[model samples]
Target chain A: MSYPEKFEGIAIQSHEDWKNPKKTKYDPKPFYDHDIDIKIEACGVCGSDIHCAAGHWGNMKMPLVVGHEIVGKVVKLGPKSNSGLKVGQRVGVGAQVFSCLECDRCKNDNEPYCTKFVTTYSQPYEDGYVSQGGYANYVRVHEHFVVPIPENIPSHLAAPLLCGGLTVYSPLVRNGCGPGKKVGIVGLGGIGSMGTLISKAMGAETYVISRSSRKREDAMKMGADHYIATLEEGDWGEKYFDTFDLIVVCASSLTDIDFNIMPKAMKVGGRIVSISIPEQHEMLSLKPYGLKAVSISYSALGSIKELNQLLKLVSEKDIKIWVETLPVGEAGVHEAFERMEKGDVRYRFTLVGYDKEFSD
Target chain B: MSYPEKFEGIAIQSHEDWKNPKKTKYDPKPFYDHDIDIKIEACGVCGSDIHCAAGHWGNMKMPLVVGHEIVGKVVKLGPKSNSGLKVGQRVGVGAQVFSCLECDRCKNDNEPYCTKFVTTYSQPYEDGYVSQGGYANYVRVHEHFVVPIPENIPSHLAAPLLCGGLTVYSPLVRNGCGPGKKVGIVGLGGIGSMGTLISKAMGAETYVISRSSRKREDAMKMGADHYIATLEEGDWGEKYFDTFDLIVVCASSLTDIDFNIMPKAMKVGGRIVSISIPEQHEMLSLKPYGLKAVSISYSALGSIKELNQLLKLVSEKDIKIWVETLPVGEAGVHEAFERMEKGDVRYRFTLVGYDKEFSD
Candidate 1:
């Protein structure tokens, strides 16, 4: 197996012209004793790419490579890393890259909420290490944060699960979405599709909520039992009054959402969990939802244990993931970013052809 | 037991002069076969009284009676009412007096959230029976809405338990507040003190949170284990960062609350349930706490079944209730309303001495 000191990636050069992608190469941080390097094979395009590249979260002065849903083959494993990790094993890394594993929250299954939580991109460590996420040729990650991609799932298919799927999946299972429960997936894009499939696989009745009937057939194709178009004739949410047990909002902004319709749609003790990391100014007014006795919650990316369980749920339940693939290059990267910003993707986009693009 | 043709009471004549009370007599609601009449003994003044009388909720056109937390001795029981209810037995009715028992929510012990829910005060019935609450000589309630006060608790002490106490108690037990849990009680007034005592009785560690150190001694008197004064030295919530398992906010208008301080104070998966029914424009912005993965919820008045369990907990645990009583009359009513608006009560105010005020 070969390891690279300098990795190549399609980078965001400026926040103003974020739509264009530029190819760049740089040396990664000095490897640690517990580091496991993976030769990248596929990476999922996430909405976070726009949030960072467009400078909504913070400006990217230097070229920053930004994709967290990484899937590849293990090329190098330090002796101090986790056990059972082989040199040729298929593995992945999600949104979170590292955490202070000694904290109480980390010892519990809440590592993502740890005070010292570090994301997979543009993070600076006290050890002088900087993160360059998965739009690159290789990913060097902490061994504990590395998870195995189960044999039943393909690389391009499982890449999105590392970030988008796991985000929605954690809140669904934690909030008791199964069996007799009815789940409504708000938005029909990337994570929205993942939420619909996962809820259905968990034996929950899945309803797809979107702006219009444009995604009606697509939702049904994904095994969604019901469709509720918010723009429909007369109160599409009327019949859903006191019906849903859980609703997962995977959209960008809830500002357009009519919260007046939500209070009556939710049952007593219902839960709405959002995985949206929208702009700083987007605020969800909660007073309208105060009467139904429902809980409004938010969840970040889940723990490594949950990611492993997510793999098991997908493999054991034989859940098929959906994604469109593009070869790793500047043009494809630019197209993917601009299309995602316009909400034009069918579901998700995974970058492939890494074998041909970077054989250094 | 003898029935009355007209009931005498203090009423709110207008929203403009809500602080001044007037005495009036009106015919009682037409008796139903499922009704039980109780001669008023004690009534607890709730914050809703101010919201209704001062027209924050709605204007009072005619003379409207305004007390729901009524504890009284049963004077009459209809033949078709609930069994084990006797003509001289003591019972109490909280905010809700009736619900369509046939609905799914009512049958499932969520009657307060039912579509046909009818409040104790100034309610209009489809049968043309307009309600006059227990600010009067007597109260006629559907037998199921009446709960038995355990022998260990006095009528005056148990009056607030019917409304304010029950509101906080439902959220506490429902959100898993128990031994080994750290609970934070925000605001130190009627429902706030109830939260402190109830959390302690439920075997949780209680922390009192307020704007200043003025309520420190009063908080400790209610058996709070810790106090967090937001105005105290450098970041009062710093030491409590990630400490609370549950925090119940009983204060009105959370716009002044620093949500940035709250996300750090809450542990992962920690819940904050607010029972504050503030103005129509009050909005809880749900963005700062989004990264911490905590839930913000609201609970309305609890179920009748929960009220009985509240009685059992108070009796079994011997939890002491705190209240400053006022005689049921015009001047005392006026004083209670005006002082409560200024937030000057030591704890709660229960209007008592019904025997002297109304001898009808």
Candidate 2:
């Protein structure tokens, strides 16, 4: 069970104290069975990374590398990797890195929902080792969690797709987001923007619903057929009552969400997928609209099979990801984090220049 | 527009003061273009009936007849009835008695969810008439809401099926309750018992989950293959984690429901149909196990089409409803309501002997 003695990556030792968050060296367990070491090429900075580093979603192990949307080159594979991954090949890993593959959920291609699922960071491996993330030069993970990246999609684009894209893509395809369907994406940030692009590519008439009219032009640019400013139009929900077949809520904040009116905006038997954690776990009275038999579901990042499907759709459609690529260094990473926290990101931010960061 | 000048029926003049609940005479509006008059034969005593009489679900029109599960013979049909309902033919009407058929929901056979839906009682018809129920000599309704009762099902049995049966049956067939599916009913009262009967007849492996073991034998009698007393076994939710593909929650009280544990008790992509109105509009956190992508839906009573389907199934399967039929008089009706309030009814109570009550 030999593993690498050390791996170099960023570390946040104190929660909410990202002021001193730095790229530092760390150690890994001796080479372990079924493990593959990846030379990190790019990593997407997600809202969850900022949340994890700030301790909003509870405390995590200290000195942690907080990244999950990882894309890299396979540098080493253990003899028992079983993934059939070869060295020097490209691969990617999303938020999930480990799950008990024997479980029904895992076996049914719902590995992300497995009870034994381990996130790429702030989670522990079965062997008591604290899990780390992809904000690093090299990383080791169970080969089972590694996905082979398609050749046509670049590393930077593929990194965010590992999480943000899959978050919206999974719900779209699972809930019938294709031809003849009218889809709505609530929130025009990273996940919602992806929802608009992927839904349009899937041949759906896509609409974007945001708090203000500020994102109206951006939504149109992202291929959405319509844009709604809820704050500007108090009767927006009523105006579009029973209009959409599916709606994906990608807004991180729930303050502006009027659950009472959301059901009116969807057709009978329509589905609303909430991809973000709600700001508060308040009781929602959906029964009024629920009688319409419309459903509300919470979807996490996605299964490996769904991810592959998304990648296929991406490659087939030549879907472009709206991402700002930054060098993999403290300054750029911190800037992106602060910018995202302040809701300044046009869409997504991906960190590249892994080789330069490691050489320094 | 020729209509009956007067009609005799029961009335609840005060909320929660059933002592004065009386079988009184009332008048009906002139027969409209598409109205059908039904000679009442039987009406099921539903919890909603008691709730309406007690005004638990908001203020209701005084001197109202509180019953929706009405089964009777069509006595008169307006010239423009257009329903093809023949005089002397048996018919039934559930909670909904009127809906704007031009609405998408009504056109799609989802009349119960239509915004213009008018319940048999405590609701208003389009022409400023406060609707009444069928605890009377006759009932006048829009032909659009009348369902023909299959000859094989008895009047008493058909009465409950209109409301209680439809309440559970609608969600069952819509959510894939059939062979190879494992279904659960989360109450053993009227609706829960109907859920068990219908789910079993639909060829699903049906289970009954209740707060106590009190209904174990009763659930078996209703064709449930398994019974789990959630109160007796605190770990029932964990024990059956990811077990059922569908669950119908019939319990009216949200206090006893552990929404957090509900997702764990269902399989990935499973659906939970909540039929009861909760006391509070509290936020429910389905996120912990929401990774499974399980959905929670609120299902109202079945549509006329679904009711027909249910009747067809009931005729083919000879599905039996557990109902206690009593004489349709003030004393018997009052007794049934009190008994139901105490959870003493075996399943449902249907008021018969309408001729005796109205004749008196």
Candidate 3:
């Protein structure tokens, strides 16, 4: 229930010095009474983190840190925080950092769509400081934004669920993807694979839709019922039009080269939820004839209530973390972002003791 | 309780002469005991009738009669034709001549979407002779398609309710255009005018969307909340985007139109229902994408039960019939179709049996 003088996390000191970084010792702004600080044990480097660090989604603040799929031990709790979180409790925080709780969207449990949103790294907070990411030994967030991790779920595995997993999971659960529903994931990379697994695990019949059959082996392992390689499938979409109930387009921004063909593969009443906001794809020429079409909407992180439900699923499935963990240090955070950009890491990479890098 | 030696309806003897038509004295067909014979008194000439007569839809059976909105007195009925209809009772029939009563669509009262649908003026019955229209003294139909006209609604007024009214009414009701909903009618001639009136009667805010503001004064008089002549008000659509919740696009096959703009003028979760199938519009590019969008659906005329409901509306609202009654003779039917092609008719033209053409 007290402010911490120092906390640790990974930082990209500057874009020119990104390939190799130095451990700069510094303290986060003094934590407020409504804020809870967590000592991070595992922080997943997401596809978005690489995009943010490389400035794919606009400029990043120098000395900026990036990691929102955070899972760690709660080292301190604020007295004024209503989260009931106690010291030593395992917890996680994702992309969202702050929201005006009084907004209609927040009141309706749609906090992600709230107008007064504060992003994890690229957005400004009320404290007049840029929000830092979870690539650190400790992350300070408003108690309202932190979610408790169930004991049955390991910190490493649960780390990616905060961002990559929730990215797909939010739409799946929100759009009624469950038993009797047929779902599709467009890309077979990190976000797409996670979407396939979660959709299947949630009792939905899922299909992996990609450019080629190259990911067939991995798709089957993730419990997908079908793998459709758009290039090789030859009129497969026309033959199976109106079959899928839901589709998640998870291509990284670079892959939306032919954005028009992606949503055309869905059925008449089906919905296509885009998880990746492509920066340079041509706007789709899709018209609304004979179909119920929806647009690409940005999703905020999951609500705490839904996060609890996801934790319950993890507990029931006894799922392990699918990550390559690097020990907490200056070199680990720097290489994680590099490997992530090249997709060198398999699925996800977790940085351990990420906060220690910022400690004096 | 017995089949007549011949059925009487107007017949187009040849395509070389549209104005000079000959009546078929007695057209023979399979006499199903469930069929009812009604004496035709009023027949509304619809847009589809002109298409069929001119072979615009398809090459119709030569020597064809073209009328679908048949309202008259039931002169005879078979024993098993128990539709609660009695002799001398005012009744009406629309485009559907007969439907396989066993199909799921028919059983559920969706006869229009059924596979075995037979149109009144164009197709031959299961018995092989071409089914004729109400351009003569008497017409025969399966009792399943005959709906008794409400006593308070006059035969002349209830005539088009069997076709034009249901054409727009079905989609409006299907798409949820009622209290709190704003509806747009795209084309102000016949179907559009009916759409505006019906939507207004249904308690929705209604507007007429015409190609030119020439019909603005007329449309406003037809109970429309406002009118937009696309020619004079080219940017009128922009002023109404996100305004209407439902819009019925009634553009005829002759109009080289672009429905791409209709969907854009609708709200986030709006729908565009096309009563008249266009000759050549980009199906893929006509759909709207700003919100949950739906487009261009065919509404085959309604079922007998629905016809009864529509008649009730006509009776309750005292809806005036905007029709020009013409004699059931060669000159009148020809002039009607001519006016239809030129888009010169006020709203509708009904063929009336005032003076006998050929008594024989």
Candidate 4:
């Protein structure tokens, strides 16, 4: 593999063999001045990886790479690079790799909703080039979407924070999750645990609400003020009427959860923000509530500015996001997705050893 | 009927005879020190009136008085009266007549959502006396629920503003409808037209969006800058993509309008606030959207403070709300509800001639 001409990545050739990925060299699109090429150090194995590869999303073109929470050192910087970022500087890139910078959404801190958004995996860039992700030796991204990692935070630890952390952190901070506010973090998985940690660090009275008491002890250790097991306990809608000011929904499915209980549990001006993106045709199923003052909002990933603040918060507060490390290769990548499918994760899996994986 | 001892009203004996109500005498509820007795002048015929009387809202108790948007003169004032309200002062009452004033919701201007809320009619007071409404000779209500009607606003004009006007006004103001904001008023019924008038008067670039062009000319005359017919024209979802900052859902049925079109028509960070309270078992079908920045909110009725401001705005602007007057009695109310059921009035109907109809 040569610099700027071609890149090697572990690519899934088809949805049928998504679990058994293979390494191959592929040509990258023509580089723009605003782009930055990062030599991969470590990357977070997000649920999106499996969702795409295992065909939960859709059948896509063959030879697609599916990783987004990328952390690495900038090997090359373009002429119009992000301010103060240079070659050899450690940086991170999340799900969003490019967006129309001139749009109103981009200017007003709502870039995640920009119509011209390009994700880092299985999506195409302008000019019809398929953008591959960081389950490989290198990944190229627009500098505007690239954020710097703090010196105090290790690459393996900073990987999950790129996507999972920002997904929860954006809505939490955007919806005023801070001192004197009572927040409920629903779901106890990768995003949910990160939400619990971040909400607690923001000086809020945080509670972890899940289906059962299985994660109750673990959540409390992660600084949750309380834990409410929805399936096992009595109606939380009645048990905690008007209790939360904000409820962050991190759960992938809301089947067993009675939505009527949401408005009943929320204060008059409370809001519910969901980070769970449904597959095609899977409805959000938020039937109307009697309480008129409550609202429902949705958020995807965070912006570069929000990502910068998240790193600062994590570095200053020394927030330890739970993650298990896996090696960067076909065997470990396949193993990670299979385990994730069976829900065998202590929150998240960060892929490491990128230097040893990609060969010359 | 002696003054303050009993009241004369047009009552529905059952859902069977809803369209054929009769004049009857009813006992008054025991009044507290916070209560004020008002001699009714005019009352607006609302959609709720038809819904309740016609059995759309289950089998309500017998001999129920339906009117709620009330305007009258204060005949007696309580010792703990609303400051500056005295006997002989013209005032108005909306749908909500009582709420626990000490709760966080009431203190924070969310009194309409308080769990202890009591509507004007059909619903019983704490003492088990069914609270009758304003299609009558007299009414005793808590002073806190009453607002002084502006001198320039006529009794009939102020009646609908109490309920229909405030229902839309609260959400429009609460969701940031003002200058430099683009708004869409969806319905065009009594509530929908009121929303259009109020949203336009709030200095927003307002558009009245309905199913067809039937209400386009009327809405345009009502200060709507644009009229987009969803059923008649091409796909509004594509034609008006990213067009509005706030979309006020004023329509009754959301069946024709595509839920996916709302987020597409709304700019990033835009919101949709609905004043449409659904009937029992009727769900507010807001399936999820790919665009995560837009939110969904609902508002029922305005507080006393908000009603006062609405009156002041109407008085200052000299805004003429379209209302057809009918004499207050069995004949007129039955006619009003029947015609409203068939979609007859220009926008709303206000029952008048209260003094002559409710003779002593």
Candidate 5:
């Protein structure tokens, strides 16, 4: 069980060091009985990571490597592995790393809602190891957190599906989105596009309502039946009031939220489930009278079973991932970080690398 | 039929004139064939009469006679009457003077909800007659508005049962206020006291939430299980929060209402139905979640069939009316209005002596 003194891996000494992650010595120890070591292939940059890295969400654990949309090859399986998942098997991990399966919530397949659960990155666990994310050459995760990517779904495309796609898909599926239901996605960004595609794939009449017509073509290209731009139309919501039966509000910033208009767009007894965390949100202070009059509800992220189903849907439906890839060549890492910070990435960006050349 | 010059009635002319008028001098013509002349033996002083006497509700037509709770002997049945009624029979006339029974709302047994309805006093009929109330020697009303008082119910008791009792009883019965329900009555003057008795009679647990404890003993005697005085116990709503299944607000004045506390006193999925008309009372603004958590509805007065049912209940249950009587003497007529203004009357004031002598 002797470990290597040095192996090529990415390391951030500080928050500002994301652009040029200093390569440091990585000791590869023997895997725990339930752990599986993964050779990293692609990692998607998440908005949550940027907030966590910059100390906006809270005080970050110093020297953190934050990237959760992880896709890799199974380099080694621990003693408890019984799935017959062998080396070089394509697998993916999402925002969650560990959950106590013995707890009631986890036992019921609602691990994310478990109060004792540990997140993928920046959160401290009961075992005392700050769970670092997939922004490394190789990551050793518990076998329960890793799922094999379907063969039809390519490695680069499947990474973001593990996080960004499931975030919207979970709420839709949980809130009864399917045939004969009109579904609306508020923002046409990464999550909104995924919502449109997934809703359409699930046999819903999907619509996209954004600030402008900038994403109208993109939304149409992604199987959206209708597109409404608030900036372009003054009486849009009033004209189409009570049109949608279900609206998924994906707008993250609360500053630009017209709370009045969102509920006005839903029919009587319709629901609006919000997935994004607004800037200034209070449970009791925010009167959802009209929304309550129409029966609106709020949702966060999904559970483990939901992610598994999302993965199956992605692979079986032949859904293409709209992502920009940043090559893991020696000199291009800084340029990749610059493109991510500038929002130049079309929708999602994943770091692609040659993981087979590294030692197992 | 020849016209009559002297009317045989108690005439309340303009504020400056009054007379114990004879039948021929009161009306210029013989009674219309469509009208039934009832000898008023008992007339209940309704709370609305106090409102009209003070000119608080609206400008009363001068030479207007006011009293809506009329229970007496039917001396002259109309020629076109279909009521199975005859002369020398007993009948009652409530707040409604006339309603075209051919209309949809009337045929459906909801004549009060009909838009083309006429009030008993301070209102004019479609036939261009200034309607007078039951506080007179004889009230000639359309047959549709006359109801037969059950044999067991006395004239004095059945008088107020027409207006005050029916107002609270209808909404209670309509909203499912029988067994397995807990009902709350807010104001305890007339409607609230009747609500307490009726709800209890209907086999529901009744609670009286009053502003003071002056009526606590009386409320308990009237079958109220719990009496919480808001004036003495400022936080009484929170003390018994989520206790009531239904709350019927019966206050007439748009006084200082604590809209927030009332909702807290309701159970999950509870309802608050207001029959009280407030002048400047604040509306109950609840959390968007509260509507699903609780329901609040407001309705006007009840229908004619509801009034019939209420009268039948009063007769069958042998319910005693907590009423004080004033002789129809010259001094008593003027003083009853003043005593009502000071809230000095026990529950109701009945004026007698309209049956001693009659001529036509």
Candidate 6:
């Protein structure tokens, strides 16, 4: 099969300027049997992308394109793609692009925890090629990492669900977030808001905890059963002691989190699922007796089966994730990052119109 | 229903002379409907007993008898004891002497995690009178906290099972310790040795991790399949990365532990059960990725049902926990404490012949 010699995408040249991604063309590797070529339609601007561009997370190779919440149409499939995917089918890819499927974690449908997992951006693939993410006109992904977009969910909405939504969704569903369960979501940002929506839809009594009352109305609007403003109320942790069966902490920064007293808000044998990239250096201290039966777990993005379940649930329940769409360019990406860094985003930002940008 | 006005027991008058507890007579409270009186035969010297006597644990009431592992003959029972106890029945009282059996945790068979749980030693009961432990001739305890010893297990052997054994046993059985599970016990002291024995008896492939090879032979004797000396081998953490399904940390002190790389010794989705008194102030720092899918839990002693199960197993399997029996007195208590503080005991010390000590 004949393939394009080069694919054009936005590339970062250095760690200094995240907003100055230049349009560049990179030579495409020869198509492997298990690879799929995607015509990028939309991609979500994740918090990790900005961090990588700014070198907040060290070990970044320069001249990289950073975006992982990818959604696109399959333009070509290798003979051994074996995913039963055809051309023109919409698909989505999350933070991970490659994993050794033979590992125990991967075999058990916990690919994100697999030791050989390769992230979509700022990671090296096994084929001696640097993995470029979805801030481009097209992307090449392994068939195993791509999932068909549910018919009811739009491409732009599905983009963020690939990463941001899956982050919280996996921990929620994995840790028993269903009927008769009380779920607490900390931080009402992109992942937190998604946690509230999904947890509520999963038949849980969902509560949102934030720093202040600023996101009270938004959390309630997002179907949260209750809202807790930590700063607005004194002794809030004590007041809500032993209230939640499970808590999903979406806060990236633990600086403001009072982990010591957080156990006061958890029932015995309850769980606290912290959804974040594990590389973030944050320390949490908890009292053993006060949180006697409570267990805390840190999770990243979900596996293929988990992502599929999330997409299916969202499509079936018409779960609307709050998102703002912008054209695929350096300016829109930079603007989204600035607002997100300042805690200004309502939920998520997705870049669209990649087809229009690279049609010529 | 006339009870003796004064009962003889060992009591610590002050923190300064904790090791040298004096045999004294104290007035006994009027028997409650749900209480049972026992002629103390044997009581184990637990690490916490020393801590409480030395005022390490707060709220230390002087003139306190510091022993929770009580085992003896059930001499008398309250009218409404309802525990179906008869005079002369072999029974045991563990760390927890009283709990509001009406609470959720208590009702669900997790009495140790109950908010109203009262330890046998240096803790207050519902009444104005403070509870006393079994470093004495007799003990009055709530029937709910007493369990009948299995027919085969001797009184001296059953003493440590009440506290030291159950601390590790509960987390092991609760967290799926059975055939095909690879369990690791850190610290081969009293609790760690019991963890090895119990985990191995549960049919798990047991491993022991210690600071040096001092306990290597002891761990093997306790049925450990593997022994890892962290200090003896450099990069042992890296050598045995992701090796355990569940790790029960029995180290009372975290001084020698490397918290940073401890998670590297666990497989993804494995659990680390740390059994320690909740008052310890040590903090643990773990990287999320390295500890990804690993859940850390702090558990105290087991519940009533769990204790019964452990005793039954010990009885049937004839599991021998190393214990040195000494006469109950200031000399014996101080000697046991000294040996334990130096990590010199084979495993544990049980104060026996309480009748002989307080007969007069």
Q: Write the per-residue lDDT of candidate 1 for residues A1-360, one digit (tens) a residue.
A: 234668788888888788776878877867888888988889999988778888888765568888999999888998787657999899999988888889999999789988788889877766756678688888888888888889989999999999999998999888888999989999988999999999999999999999889999999999999998887736655678888888998897777676657657888888887888777666666444444588777888888888988888988988887899988778888888988888888889999988887566
Q: Which stretches of candidate 2 lie over 4 Å from their true place?
A: A1-4, A278-292, B1-3, B278-292
Error of 1 at A82 (Å): 2.7
Q: Is the docking of candidate 1 incorrect, acceptable, medium or high quality?
A: medium
Clashing pairs for model 4 are: B187-B251
Q: TM-scores, in order shown?
A: 0.96, 0.96, 0.68, 0.96, 0.55, 0.95
Quote model 1's iRMS: 2.6
List native contact recovery per candidate, as a fraction of 1. Answer: 0.69, 0.59, 0.07, 0.78, 0.00, 0.50
- The candidate, 3 or 5, that scores higher on lDDT is 3
Q: lDDT per prediction? A: 0.84, 0.83, 0.72, 0.85, 0.70, 0.83
Candidate 6's C-alpha runs over 4 A off are A1-3, A278-282, A285-291, B1-3, B278-281, B284-289
Residue A268 displacement (Å), model 3: 10
Ten-residue stretch with the least lDDT total in model 1 chain B: B283-292
lDDT of 3 at A188: 80
lDDT, candidate 3, equals 0.72
DockQ per candidate, 2 decimals:
0.60, 0.50, 0.13, 0.65, 0.06, 0.51
Tens digits of lDDT, candidate 5, A1-360: 112233354555566655566545444433578788887888876656555655556566566666788898887789998766788898888888777778645776766655577777777667666767466667777788888888888877888877888888887886678999888998876667778888888989998888878778888999888998888877676777757777887754545557656666665435666666532233323332333224443454567688889889987888886787776533334555566556566777777764532344
Sorted on DockQ, best first, the list reads: 4, 1, 6, 2, 3, 5
Q: Please give the clash total of every predicted structure, in order.
A: 0, 7, 18, 1, 13, 1
True contacts kept of 2: 0.59
Candidate 4 stretches with Cα past 4 Å from truth are A79-84, A279-281, B78-84, B278-281
lDDT, residue A266, candidate 4:
84
Q: Model 4 chain A: which ten-residue window has the lowest total lDDT? A: A283-292
- CA lDDT, candidate 2, residue A237: 68
Which model, 1 or 5, shows the larger DockQ? Answer: 1
Ten contiguous residues with the weakest lDDT in model 2 chain A: A278-287
Q: How would you encode candidate 3's per-residue C-alpha lDDT over B231-263 as one tens digit per residue?
A: 775666577765787777786752445655665
List chain A TM-scores, every candidate, in order.
Answer: 0.96, 0.95, 0.90, 0.97, 0.88, 0.95
- Pick the winner on DockQ between candidates 3 and 6: 6
